[PDB]
Ligand binder design. Sequence first.
Ligand code: CLA
Ligand code: CLA
Ligand code: CLA
Ligand code: CLA
Ligand code: CLA
Ligand code: CLA
Ligand SMILES: CCCCCCCCCCCCCCCC(=O)OC[C@H](CO[C@@H]1O[C@H](CS(=O)(=O)O)[C@@H](O)[C@H](O)[C@H]1O)OC(=O)CCCCCCCCCCCCCCC
Ligand SMILES: CCCCCCCCCCCCCCCC(=O)OC[C@H](COP(=O)(O)OC[C@@H](O)CO)OC(=O)CCCCCCCCCCCCCCC
Ligand SMILES: CC1=C(/C=C/C(C)=C\C=C\C(C)=C/C=C/C=C(C)/C=C/C=C(C)/C=C/C2=C(C)C(=O)CCC2(C)C)C(C)(C)CCC1
Ligand SMILES: CC1=C(/C=C/C(C)=C/C=C/C(C)=C/C=C/C=C(C)/C=C/C=C(C)/C=C/C2=C(C)CCCC2(C)C)C(C)(C)CCC1
Ligand SMILES: CC1=C(C/C=C(\C)CCC[C@H](C)CCC[C@H](C)CCCC(C)C)C(=O)c2ccccc2C1=O
Ligand code: SF4
Ligand code: SF4
Ligand code: SF4
Ligand SMILES: [Ca+2]
Ligand SMILES: [Mg+2]
Lengths: 141, 143, 75, 75, 75, 80, 31, 731, 40
Amino acid sequence: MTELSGQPPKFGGSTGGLLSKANREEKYAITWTSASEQVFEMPTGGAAIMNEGENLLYLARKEQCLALGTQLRTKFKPKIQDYKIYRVYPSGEVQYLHPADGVFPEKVNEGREAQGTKTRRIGQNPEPVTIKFSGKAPYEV
Amino acid sequence: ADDFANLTPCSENPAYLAKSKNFLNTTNDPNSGKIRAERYASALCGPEGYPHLIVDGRFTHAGDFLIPSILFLYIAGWIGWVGRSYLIEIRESKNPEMQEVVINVPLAIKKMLGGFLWPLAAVGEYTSGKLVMKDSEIPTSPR
Amino acid sequence: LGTADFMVHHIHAFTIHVTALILLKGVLYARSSRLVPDKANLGFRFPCDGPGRGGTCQVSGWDHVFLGLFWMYNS
Amino acid sequence: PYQAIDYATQLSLFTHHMWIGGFLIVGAGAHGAIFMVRDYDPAKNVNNLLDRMLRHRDAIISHLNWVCIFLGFHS
Amino acid sequence: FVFAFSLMFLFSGRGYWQELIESIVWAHNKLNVAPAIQPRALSIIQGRAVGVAHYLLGGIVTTWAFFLARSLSIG
Amino acid sequence: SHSVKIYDTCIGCTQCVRACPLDVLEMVPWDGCKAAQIASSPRTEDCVGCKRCETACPTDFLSIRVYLGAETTRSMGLAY
Amino acid sequence: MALSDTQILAALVVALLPAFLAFRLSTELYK
Amino acid sequence: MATKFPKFSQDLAQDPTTRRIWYGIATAHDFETHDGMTEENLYQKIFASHFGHIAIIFLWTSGTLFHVAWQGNFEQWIKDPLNIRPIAHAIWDPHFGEGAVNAFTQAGASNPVNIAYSGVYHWFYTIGMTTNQELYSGAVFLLVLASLFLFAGWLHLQPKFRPSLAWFKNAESRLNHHLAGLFGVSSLAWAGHLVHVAIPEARGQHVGWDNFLSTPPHPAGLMPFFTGNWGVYAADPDTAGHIFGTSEGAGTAILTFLGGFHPQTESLWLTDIAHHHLAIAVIFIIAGHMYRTNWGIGHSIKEILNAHKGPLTGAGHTNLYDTINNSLHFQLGLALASLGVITSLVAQHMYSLPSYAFIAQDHTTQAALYTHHQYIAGFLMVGAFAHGAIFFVRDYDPVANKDNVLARMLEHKEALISHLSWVSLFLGFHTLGLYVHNDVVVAFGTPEKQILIEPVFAQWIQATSGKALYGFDVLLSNPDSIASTTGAAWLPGWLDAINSGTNSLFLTIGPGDFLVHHAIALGLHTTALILIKGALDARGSKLMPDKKDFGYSFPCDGPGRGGTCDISAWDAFYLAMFWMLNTLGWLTFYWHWKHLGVWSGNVAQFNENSTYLMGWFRDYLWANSAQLINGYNPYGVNNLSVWAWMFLFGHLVWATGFMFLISWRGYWQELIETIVWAHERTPLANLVRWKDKPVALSIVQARLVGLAHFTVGYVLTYAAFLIASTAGKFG
Amino acid sequence: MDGSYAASYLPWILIPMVGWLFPAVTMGLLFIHIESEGEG
Ligand code: CLA
Ligand code: CLA
Ligand code: CLA
Ligand code: CLA
Ligand code: CLA
Ligand code: CLA
Ligand SMILES: CCCCCCCCCCCCCCCC(=O)OC[C@H](CO[C@@H]1O[C@H](CS(=O)(=O)O)[C@@H](O)[C@H](O)[C@H]1O)OC(=O)CCCCCCCCCCCCCCC
Ligand SMILES: CCCCCCCCCCCCCCCC(=O)OC[C@H](COP(=O)(O)OC[C@@H](O)CO)OC(=O)CCCCCCCCCCCCCCC
Ligand SMILES: CC1=C(/C=C/C(C)=C\C=C\C(C)=C/C=C/C=C(C)/C=C/C=C(C)/C=C/C2=C(C)C(=O)CCC2(C)C)C(C)(C)CCC1
Ligand SMILES: CC1=C(/C=C/C(C)=C/C=C/C(C)=C/C=C/C=C(C)/C=C/C=C(C)/C=C/C2=C(C)CCCC2(C)C)C(C)(C)CCC1
Ligand SMILES: CC1=C(C/C=C(\C)CCC[C@H](C)CCC[C@H](C)CCCC(C)C)C(=O)c2ccccc2C1=O
Ligand code: SF4
Ligand code: SF4
Ligand code: SF4
Ligand SMILES: [Ca+2]
Ligand SMILES: [Mg+2]
């Protein structure tokens, strides 16, 4: 969020990358360190080469960044788990996104507040007729 | 009395007679058409000369539906009963799905050969409580 | 060969081009798309990736073959 | 000898070979897709023909899309 | 008939059929005749495969009967 | 944005979060199950509604539920 | 006898009343 | 991108894609899900919309009257209604060439024209109208009536004049008024019009606004009605040799019950029609005095429902008053189901018992009317079941209907759905088996080996009403029977009309009618199966136990739990629409082929070739297209050109719907992504950017739009064929 | 295209108004309305 660093992956270009949304609306960044210069698959099509050391790459969506991240941590002989994903606005604001609290979300970490939790079963949702003409749905109450 | 006036016996119907003199041979027997003509000249024909089957239940036309109905029902109840019986017998064999996919030929033949008594078998299972299950013991979906 | 032959030859070129469009898109996007950037992990044959992203039914290469069958039959 | 005068044989052979060819072509699409999902190794296709095809799939397909629209309208 | 039959598989989806199968499985459990191999509706991919197989079979058989009657009845 | 709710039948197997391709969910401490953890959905603004999480759920009918809602650029999965 | 030129023109003028009323009803239902 | 439209849903108006527009169109009439909607505001907006819709009906009728009176041939067609073709309106199309101009300058007109098949000329003539002036006056009056209803709708949106929810839920008063006033007083008014205008005008007596106050409809005035004897109003009924619109063989009676058909017009007797309307007016007026309102006497529907319990039905109909009166979807389903029943009744009665003069001789209009009304009824039935499902999704309260008939239906839904499936399989297997057996046995040169089942049940029923053809001699067919020895004033006319093979009154039937009736049974049972199983599983199944939480319509529930496409009750509606169209196709094919044989005097074609499906394929479909497909030709054009073009158009629309039905969404969204890329990277076109992001259609939207195309093509194709074939043979 | 009915000059201009002018004008009004970025 200070200033993103890292070399761009060695890549000859493609038609599958950023469009107008990137400058008008929002784009996404993913950084990661690699112990070696090596080939990886671009989520936007084709092969690219990551540099030895730090790497910084811009993509159009959060999902493309997370797909690249899964590829990094599950498809290289020594894993790459230090990748960071940010949201970037045209104003220049950079919003750190992933991993949210410095710990991957699959494993418990202290300090997280439950969101969207219900203290009931799915079968214990109320009848819709009981909540009609309100703004809610049985899972929102 | 004058019932079924819209129809006439095929032996009376002249269009049927003209067409039956030309009944083709369905097999190798050069008399198959002639046997067909003689056989169908007993039913009730229409103005076009083809036989019409009366299935309102009168026994004068019992051969038009009642007899084949009885025959089919005996055979179909037989098939269903022996199949259900084999299906029940598999369940006590630890892995029933395999014998559903790979048939136990001796057991299945034993079950098939004993199907001629399926009406009494079904009556006994009805009285004994084996045929039908209780509602409160059958899985159902939310209402 | 005359006017009707011209018209039907261009019908042929059209239907062949559409069949090629479907199957070539199937091959070139089997790994990924802007919609589904991890399609490769989903396999060659699979129904979709859910009602999300507006709906992703028939993105697989298999489904492109499935549609190209109809268009080849048309051609 | 005598096949052209037998119009039924002529029509039947033409159409039969047509259908066989169409099915084989659609299968070719299927197996290009299966190659892409199962055997394509990006580390073995760096800046070669296949890689560049992937890298401008959008140009290829948008243009094929437009050619099909033009060919359909004008046929 | 086969062409028309294919439209059931192509125009629908497996959820409806799985629920219908639920009702029929209830009917079977009522008489103690439900199979150990539980009936499931066809998969989404298989629904499409059956639909397209029947579409092609029916349409092609139609054209085949048509072509053969025609070309055999024209000297 | 879509809604994602987590009910108390959660066994905390973490397959919810492992399946999410957009990092909507988290594992947070809890006490209802042996694993002492439950799934949470703090980032539903990035949810696209692919339903992978529920496809991963083992409990008899899901402990995680995705109800598709107001469509945005993010929820429609748009790269443009 | 046939319909008159004036009866056709008088029909459109009369139809101007339900047009205005339909405008009012539609705009009220928009509220 | 703030975006106002649609103002009733912030969720949609915040959608940055073209979806926002589509859904804005598709959810506007779903008032219940508008932002901030209350129950009272709902009922009030629905009230104003009702007023507007009634005004639209009146304006459409005004247009029909006005165009017949302006560009038609009403007065000419009165002179000879059996040889002149009635005119709908004039054609004005700059695309026309000389051939089409000449081809459509028909029916005696000097300009291009369309021939009307709405049966509207026969209706207006039997009503008593005889000039373009009277039609024009009726059209202008309907203009004024539409204005009145538009103003009423507007007025009842103003704060003072907005009716309250309690007023909308006053079921007893509304039932009293609709039975007594809307049904009874209106039927009495139509009996009065018939006695005052129609019956006199049919006898050469002009009765209009300028003399009806002075000319009594009967020489003996109202005193015979007031004193005692009403047989004077039966007087001398029109003799068998009455010539419509003249005094030849005319009488003075106004109320009769001689039944049968007027010999010249081949329709129901006007005096009988007026008498029917008077009688049912009395009955409906009496009906409108059942429920209490403001005077203590009368019935409470809640009491009657709570009083019909049962030893084997649990709680009976308890609390169904609030269950029905609180659910607009329950009431709408009741309405649509009953309305579809009576629309099918209209269709089945107007072709068999026509009431308009010389309409039984207009085969194209009769076919078109029957098909039209049966299609409308099918749509109504599907909608009734759709809204039953929507009720279960949105309004059903399980604790208030606990153990009553509704919940009890829900409790054995497995048995209902399963036995519907069983009878569907039964009918399908065996009807297809008999048809295919007949096909193969006739194909191999042995048509005598068919299974031709005589329809003895319906034949016996026809015999119960006097039909002596089959020789059953039961009830009315038996003169020694007490049902015939009653001295009823209608028996001679009814017997003369039913024992003559010149009308459509209880048409003769054979094995083909049997087979097609079982096809109709299959279609009805299968559509009911789809609809009922959708409704009962609308709240939940084992695949989706929480489906009620997701709403009536939604794309699916994803590829999990095996896959769940077309899982919602809306999807069940969508699937049943195809079976509705199929059932209507069989039904209307049946009607049209049989009536073609009847009208042409060759019943033998249908009787002999309907027993196998190649017969329908060749003798009905293939044959009756010959003129249709020749409406335009390499050799020229005739008046069937429009119908040939529409035939191909319906085919094209049907086939287009197939695309939305077979190819699903992701394939399209990815293609549109390529097209988006192309636009962003093309110079000059670069200058222009879209305001809404282009995205593929949605899952549900694809089902809806594919079905809409499919249905449009279905209807237009069959209408083109029906109209063109019947007008080329008999027009 | 001609007309023996009364006031047959009416379709002459009414057909282009119902087919061209009314559609173009109403689609323009609706286009502007559904794209108006006011408040919501
Ligand atoms: C030399 C040609 C060739 C070769 C050997 C292969 C090889 C293979 N293909 Mg391919 N393919 C081909 C041609 C070929 N294909 C063609 C012509 C098409 C176009 C239709 C396809 C489209 C295709 C698809 C879409 C898929 C494959 C798949 C496969 C793999 C699984 C085979 C299988 O399905 O098992 C078993 C075969 C069956 C169950 C076939 C039964 C159903 C058939 C179609 C019924 C045919 C009816 C009959 C012809 C006429 C009616 C008779 C009836 C009335 C009784 C396999 C490695 C699958 C895969 O996953 O690849 C890894 C798969 O997804 N192929
Ligand atoms: C007759 C039915 C039908 C029709 C009309 C179409 C139409 C189309 N399909 Mg399709 N398809 C169908 C059936 C049909 N499909 C079915 C059953 C399936 C299931 C397998 C598919 C699956 C399918 C796929 C997978 C694809 C297509 C594609 C296409 C497009 C090809 C490009 C083109 O032709 O441009 C021109 C358009 C036409 C020729 C349509 C007719 C236009 C008329 C002649 C002129 C219009 C007059 C004017 C506009 C009227 C305006 C009226 C006014 C009141 C507004 C095209 C619009 C391909 C595509 O999108 O290519 C880019 C594509 O990939 N189809
Ligand atoms: C006698 C008093 C009276 C009368 C005249 C009416 C009349 C009407 N009311 Mg109303 N109502 C009343 C009192 C009355 N109301 C009271 C006191 C209340 C409060 C308790 C209500 C509250 C109420 C509500 C909330 C609504 C109505 C509505 C309606 C209209 C129903 C729709 C329609 O037009 O179908 C007309 C139907 C017929 C003429 C007869 C039915 C058709 C028959 C049965 C079958 C067809 C007949 C024949 C065979 C076919 C002819 C074919 C032809 C082409 C030859 C109708 C005109 C609805 C409406 O549309 O609002 C404007 C509506 O929303 N009423
Ligand atoms: C008086 C009867 C009546 C009433 C008032 C309602 C009322 C309602 N219905 Mg219902 N319904 C009805 C009859 C009725 N329906 C019938 C007959 C059917 C069977 C078709 C249905 C089936 C049904 C379903 C499945 C659903 C509803 C829904 C709804 C609600 C939303 C309406 C909406 O916004 O849709 C919007 C309206 C449209 C999109 C109209 C498009 C269709 C047009 C008219 C056809 C276009 C033809 C085309 C131009 C052809 C031109 C020909 C030319 C080219 C030659 C609403 C409360 C929906 C709902 O909200 O569920 C709760 C819902 O999903 N209805
Ligand atoms: C000709 C087209 C066609 C056919 C044959 C069917 C068939 C059927 N549909 Mg379907 N449907 C169709 C079109 C068709 N559909 C379309 C276009 C749609 C819209 C998407 C639907 C949507 C639909 C729904 C939602 C439902 C049905 C239902 C049914 C079943 C009704 C019960 C019945 O008839 O029993 C008898 C069956 C038949 C007559 C068909 C089988 C015929 C074969 C020849 C039987 C012989 C077996 C054969 C020898 C097998 C060996 C094959 C071997 C050669 C490889 C039936 C199996 C309902 C159902 O499931 O009922 C329980 C149901 O719920 N249909
Ligand atoms: C719904 C009723 C209706 C319908 C379907 C038609 C149909 C037609 N009219 Mg007609 N018209 C009608 C009522 C109707 N008319 C009435 C009541 C009058 C007397 C004022 C006229 C006066 C009129 C004239 C002067 C002309 C036509 C003409 C035409 C033809 C071309 C349309 C046109 O250019 O004129 C436009 C029509 C008008 C300016 C009159 C307004 C129509 C009514 C009053 C409003 C209907 C609103 C409607 C119910 C709203 C439905 C919306 C719905 C889709 C949601 C067309 C076939 C032309 C013709 O002769 O064809 C060769 C022509 O020149 N009409
Ligand atoms: C075949 C013939 C049938 C019968 C003859 C009927 C024709 C006569 C209709 C007269 C209409 C006159 C229009 C001009 C006046 C106007 O628009 O006032 C509109 C205002 C509404 O003010 C509204 O008031 C609102 C506030 S509040 O609600 O008043 O508080 C305010 O927001 C809004 O701006 C304001 O407009 O209406 C009134 O306040 C009174 C309306 C008077 C209408 C009289 C009708 C006569 C009844 C006959 C029919 C009864 C049948 C009922 C049972 C079936
Ligand atoms: C050929 C057409 C027939 C086929 C239709 C479908 C097959 C029907 C098989 C369903 C068996 C139902 C089992 C009932 C289960 C049952 O026994 O419920 C229990 C019930 C006893 O309770 P009660 O009769 O006291 O309940 C009546 C209410 O007052 C209480 O809710 O028995 C009946 O209702 C007998 C009437 C059955 C109604 C049969 C349905 C068909 C009716 C047809 C229309 C009748 C004429 C209406 C004229 C207005
Ligand atoms: C004072 C009064 C009485 C005197 C009443 C008098 C002196 C006249 C009464 C007339 C009455 C009470 C009703 C007249 C009604 C006429 C109506 C209602 C017309 C309705 C038309 C409709 C609805 C639409 C018709 C259509 C049109 C326009 C067409 O052109 C085509 C057909 C159709 C589409 C149907 C008496 C002493 C007796 C009793 C005490 C009260
Ligand atoms: C889903 C649902 C629903 C439903 C719906 C529907 C759609 C229904 C229906 C139904 C139907 C659609 C029915 C039908 C019927 C019929 C009847 C009921 C009949 C009657 C009859 C009779 C009894 C007659 C008799 C006779 C004769 C035959 C002749 C002579 C005369 C006499 C009278 C004797 C509701 C909403 C409600 C609720 C929710 C759920
Ligand atoms: C009808 C239907 C079903 C139900 C169909 C089922 C359950 C298949 C039933 C097949 C039976 C059990 C086998 C009959 C066919 C045999 C393969 C033929 C063998 C014949 C030999 C014995 C000679 C789906 O599951 C489905 C899924 C997705 C989209 C559409 C549909 C769909 O339309
Ligand atoms: S959502 Fe369900 S499957 Fe996923 S971790 Fe929670 S309990 Fe386990
Ligand atoms: S629906 Fe998809 S994006 Fe949303 S939480 Fe589940 S897996 Fe993640
Ligand atoms: S409808 Fe489409 S997205 Fe939904 S489950 Fe089926 S294939 Fe998948
Ligand atoms: Ca008069
Ligand atoms: Mg009638």
